């Protein structure tokens, strides 16, 4: 049961659907550039 891409708010606009995929890659780059 993975859950990397968080659920968008505000009824999730049709533009936010594109975020549920492009952000999945940017998410890999988020866990590889953080500290505390």
Considering the domain boundaries, does residue 2 fall inside one?
A: no
Contact 12, 19 (CB under 8 A): no
Considering the domain boundaries, does residue 4 fall inside one?
A: no
Considering the domain boundaries, does residue 24 fall inside one?
A: yes
Domain count, the chain: 1
Contact 21, 36 (CB under 8 A): no
User: Which domain range does residue 25 map to?
Assistant: 11-36
Rg (CA), the chain: 11
Contact 25, 6 (CB under 8 A): no
Q: Which of 10, 9, 4 is nearest to 23 (CA)?
A: 4
Contact 4, 24 (CB under 8 A): yes
3 state SS of 26: helix
Q: How was this structure determined?
A: NMR
12, two tokens: 């999730």
Considering the domain boundaries, does residue 30 fall inside one?
A: yes
């Amino acid at each position: 049961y993975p859950a990397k891409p968080e659920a968008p708010g505000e009824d999730a606009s049709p533009e936010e659907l594109s975020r549920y995929y492009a952000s999945l890659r940017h998410y890999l780059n988020l866990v590889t550039r953080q500290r505390y």
